[PDB]
Amino acid sequence: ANTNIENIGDGAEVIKRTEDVSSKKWGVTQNVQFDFVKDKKYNKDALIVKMQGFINSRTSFSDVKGSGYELTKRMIWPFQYNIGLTTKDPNVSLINYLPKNKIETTDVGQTLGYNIGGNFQSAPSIGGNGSFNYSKTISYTQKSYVSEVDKQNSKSVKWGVKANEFVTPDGKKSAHDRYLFVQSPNGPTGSAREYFAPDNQLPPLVQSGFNPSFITTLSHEKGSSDTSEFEISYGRNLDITYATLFPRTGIYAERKHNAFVNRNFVVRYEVNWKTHEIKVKG
Amino acid sequence: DYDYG
């Protein structure tokens, strides 16, 4: 049909589209690839959607205003990054997703392969074989975090990249430890920042943000309606850690878990199966 | 900053 077209064997090709959509308000960039598989020997259309970009951690360190909170400081930080794709149109369904299972390794690298005749296959690795007519990979780093499939069904998929276990001066600390990232400040002139672990102790997913890399394939019966809408959501759930310096007992910490849930940037897209195009809606 | 900074 148009522009970036890759012949992947006889009677088959892939038409490659992209969209880049950012939100300074939400601190997100969606850099999405949408690859149409056009195979005369497959009775369905298929769109491989690869979701990359950036989700800002939105980590911050602040004073707490008001009487009784003069030596109480606040750290907001992402307990989980949220990535999902949802549709409501009867004419479309999700037929695969990557990662498909929980993955706890620091690096995640997986491949979705396609072979003529409607045959998809996924592997929890990169560089396995030259047996596919077309392949797409995902690659991301999640130091101290784990990836879980929060929801998966024929119409939606949602992954959570969630805080798990961290390296600290005093050893390994669980993501559920209320004193995680808490330290005694050096001087009562200690700014809010000084009540919390320095940057060199905060892993990238806490200090900076996350660069997603996820795939799901949308399936559409050839001949059904020309278009489908779907939404891609990227965001975070933030926790708060409050640290109070008491006169004689020292540093005291309290965690507000799931303090800000679903702070997500949702973009609605339209796929046109007939023209092999993608548009951003709204 | 959630109106805290």
Residue numbers in the entry:
A (entry chain A): 28 to 309
B (entry chain M): 25 to 29
Kindly provide excerpts from the paper associated with this entry:
Staphylococcus aureus (SA) leukocidin ED (LukED) belongs to a family of bicomponent pore forming toxins that play important roles in SA immune evasion and nutrient acquisition. LukED targets specific G protein-coupled chemokine receptors to lyse human erythrocytes (red blood cells) and leukocytes (white blood cells). Each leukotoxin is made up of two subunits of approximately 30 kDa: a host cell targeting S-component (HlgA, HlgC, LukE, lukS-PV, and LukA/G), and a polymerization F- component (HlgB, LukD, lukF-PV, and LukB/H), which can bind the plasma membrane through highly conserved phosphocholine binding sites. Each toxin is composed of two domains: a central β sandwich called the CAP domain and involved in inter-protomer interactions, and a RIM domain which contains several divergent loops driving host cell specificity.
Although CCR2 is normally an in vivo target of HlgA rather than LukE, Tam and coworkers have shown that cells expressing WT CCR5 or a CCR5 chimera harbouring the CCR2 N-terminal region display the same susceptibility to LukED intoxication. We found that sTyr26 and sTyr28 of CCR2 respectively bind to site 1 and site 2 through the same interactions observed in the pCS and ACKR1 peptide-bound structures. Two alternate conformations were clearly visible for sTyr26, differing by a rotation of approximately 90° of the phenyl ring. However, residual electron density was still present after model building and suggested the existence of a third alternate conformation of sTyr26, with its sulfate group interacting at site 2. This third alternate conformation clashes with the sulfate group of sTyr28, suggesting the existence of a minor population of molecules in which sTyr28 unbinds while sTyr26 flips its sidechain to the second site. Our work demonstrates that site 1 is used to bind ACKR1 sTyr 41, CCR2 sTyr 26, and CCR5 sTyr 10, while site 2 can accommodate an additional downstream sulfotyrosine such as CCR5 sTyr 14 or 15, or CCR2 sTyr 28. Site 2 is only conserved in LukE and HlgA, and likely confers to these toxins the ability to bind the second sTyr of the motif in the N-termini of CCR2, CCR5, and CXCR2.
